[PDB]
Amino acid sequence: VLIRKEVDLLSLKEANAIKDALYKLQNDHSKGGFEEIAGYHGYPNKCPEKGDDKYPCCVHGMPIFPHWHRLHTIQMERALKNHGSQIGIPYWNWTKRMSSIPAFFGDDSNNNPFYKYHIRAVNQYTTRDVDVELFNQTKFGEYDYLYYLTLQVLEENSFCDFEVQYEILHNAVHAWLGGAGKYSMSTLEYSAYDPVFMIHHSSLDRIWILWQQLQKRRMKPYYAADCAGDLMKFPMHPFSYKSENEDEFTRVNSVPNIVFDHYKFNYDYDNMRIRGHDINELEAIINELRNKDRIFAGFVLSGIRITATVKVFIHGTGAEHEEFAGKFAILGGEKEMPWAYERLLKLDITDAVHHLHLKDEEIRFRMEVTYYNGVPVSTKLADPLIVHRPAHASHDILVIPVGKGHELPPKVVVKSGTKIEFTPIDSSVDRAMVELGSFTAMAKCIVPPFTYNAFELNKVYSVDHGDYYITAGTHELCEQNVRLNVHVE
């Protein structure tokens, strides 16, 4: 019964009514008030439930990220209803062309409750530092940044791969709203205190529902996950804590497998259009995207304990011409749960690769990783792999540069029928990669003095199912980073 409307479609009467509910909610000091419910997410760190060894509860970098933030938005939405709201939490279609922030939350006049919040526990107001690139975005060919990343989400047809693209898209808006401020959307510890937090996650949830609709029409799964399955079964925190959640309906219904189905929670959206496009038009756009070759930088990411922007530059094999290829954001915090996607975040680099006339095996990378506050990030990112998606292909080609001391993702999960190809980044790798057949043989670099289950350099191989424990053809190289686990379907 609670309809979520786009912020610019709210009537004056509706905007004022929900603003009045938020004011009442923000002035509610109980476990049902704004400060306590926002506190589910990061500061003050509400988990184990009792213990004094506390850490932020929100799930990121993991397959239940969407469920966690879906339920958090539901929690805030029911709290606003308990304080008089008659509508759902409004959303912001941040895929649209834009020259300013919507007034509903960007206009401070008349003590707008959605403009900022005074965090009582730390005696700080939330801040924003809006990156004007929002109004002037880079393009992937014809498509503006945020809109293209949203199309990339909708192209995915399996849940755990969807989730990576979904979360990285959502990270961009966090970074672009929050900027350098600690008590901002940039920070896992404090982002949930900005009233725009709930609007952004109401926007993101709409994309998840749209994806679920696409999956239904594809006859692919939309109410179950293809990974982390044991974990989909456990109630989420702190929603399940009696000391922390006075909303019994959400406390009882906090299991991700339940949260898959949003209809159980009595909300819907005014419309599902992106850039004026209904689902039929989006299906046609997604199909158009299959008509040309695409090349991606495939990042296999793990946690870095601080929010940062990754800028990606490419160059060919000689000492010559470097081009900026794109960027994305990673959220993080010093007390974050350890996370590792083990799946590819695909940054489309097609136009830079073509401009530099590089063949797949020639693409080399350089990253600048900078925290939200300008501090350089010391945690090293592995270089991305090269993902080649031919025009109308059913399977991607994963191109993997290897060399002594060149870090690989420890593990990457790929669809059955994915093709892979190893190529040397320097002359240290001068014989075929080998498949050792076990975790232990790879960990101990038990590599035989002969060629064995070989992946010849610069040859393409299809992988079908199971685990591949691939290393360089010598023990010493295997001990110098040249090994990884390819896990298939």
Residues of the shown chain interacting with ligand [O-] in the complex, contacts defined by CB under 6 A: 58, 191
142 binds its own copies, rule: CB under 8 A: no
Q: What are phi and psi of 46, to 5 degrees?
A: -105, 20
Task: Please tell me the number of Cα atoms within 13 Å of 111 on its side-chain side.
Answer: 5
340 binds its own copies, rule: CB under 8 A: yes
Partner touching 443 among its own copies, Cu ion, ligand [O-], none, CB below 5 to 8 Å by kind = its own copies
424 binds its own copies, rule: CB under 8 A: no
Partner touching 405 among its own copies, Cu ion, ligand [O-], none, CB below 5 to 8 Å by kind = none
Q: Residue 200 and residue 191: Cα distance in Å, rounded? A: 11
Q: Give the single-character DSSP code of 58.
A: -
Q: What are phi and psi of 139, to 5 degrees?
A: -125, 150
Please report how close the Cβ of residue 58 comes to ligand [O-] at its closest, in angstroms. Answer: 6
State which residue has the least CB distance to Cu ion.
58
54 binds its own copies, rule: CB under 8 A: yes
Binding mask 378-417 for its own copies (x = CB under 8 A): -------------------------------xxx------
Q: Residue 69 and residue 318: Cα distance in Å, rounded? A: 45
Size of the site for its own copies (CB under 8 A): 38
Residue with tokens 């999956």: 215
Please report how close the Cβ of residue 169 comes to ligand [O-] at its closest, in angstroms. Answer: 12
Q: Which residue stretch of 237-245, 278-286, 318-326, 431-439 sits at the interface with its own copies (rule: CB under 8 A)?
A: 431-439
Please report how close the Cβ of residue 456 comes to Cu ion at its closest, in angstroms. Answer: 29
Residue 167's contacts (CB-CB under 8 Å, 6 or more residues apart) are 60, 61, 65, 66
Which residues does the annotation place in the binding site?
A: 41, 60, 69, 170, 174, 201
Cβ–Cβ < 8 Å for 38, 193: yes
Both structure tokens of 3: 């309809």
Question: Smaller CB distance to Cu ion: residue 58 or 385?
Answer: 58
Please report how close the Cβ of residue 58 comes to Cu ion at its closest, in angstroms. Answer: 4
The Cα-based distances of 466 to 198, 463, 485, 489 in angstroms read: 40, 9, 10, 7
The Cα-based distances of 174 to 62, 64, 71 in angstroms read: 18, 19, 19
Residue 156's contacts (CB-CB under 8 Å, 6 or more residues apart) are 162, 165, 211
Question: Smaller CB distance to Cu ion: residue 22 or 58?
Answer: 58
Partner touching 17 among its own copies, ligand [O-], Cu ion, none, CB below 5 to 8 Å by kind = none
Handedness of CA 278, 281, 285, 287 (dihedral sign): positive
Question: Smaller CB distance to its own copies: residue 263 or 450?
Answer: 450
Both structure tokens of 143: 């498509």
Question: Smaller CB distance to Cu ion: residue 56 or 384?
Answer: 56
446 binds its own copies, rule: CB under 8 A: yes
Q: What are phi and psi of 259, to 5 degrees?
A: -65, -15
Q: Which helix (H) or strand (E) holds 159?
A: helix 159-178
465 binds its own copies, rule: CB under 8 A: yes
Cβ–Cβ < 8 Å for 18, 90: yes
Both structure tokens of 65: 């990220």
Question: Smaller CB distance to its own copies: residue 161 or 342?
Answer: 342
Question: Smaller CB distance to its own copies: residue 275 or 335?
Answer: 335
Q: Give the single-character DSSP code of 191.
A: G
463 binds its own copies, rule: CB under 8 A: no
Helix (H, G, I), strand (E, B) or coil at 298: strand
Please report how close the Cβ of residue 65 comes to ligand [O-] at its closest, in angstroms. Answer: 8
Per-residue burial over 254-263, b if 16 or more Cβ lie within 10 Å, else e, is: bbbbbbbebe
Q: Residue 131 and residue 174: Cα distance in Å, rounded? A: 10
Helix (H, G, I), strand (E, B) or coil at 305: coil
462 binds its own copies, rule: CB under 8 A: no
Among positions 158, 339, 350, 461, the unique one binding its own copies when judged by CB under 8 A: 339
Question: Smaller CB distance to ligand [O-]: residue 69 or 315?
Answer: 69
Question: Smaller CB distance to its own copies: residue 390 or 410?
Answer: 410
Among positions 22, 38, 58, 168, the unique one binding Cu ion when judged by CB under 5 A: 58
Which residues does the annotation place in the binding site for Cu(2+)?
A: 41, 60, 69, 170, 174, 201
Can you give the binding site for its own copies, defined by CB under 8 A?
Answer: 48, 53-55, 62, 230, 300, 302-303, 334-340, 342, 409-411, 436-441, 443-444, 446-452, 465-466, 485
Can you give the binding site for Cu ion, defined by CB under 5 A?
Answer: 58
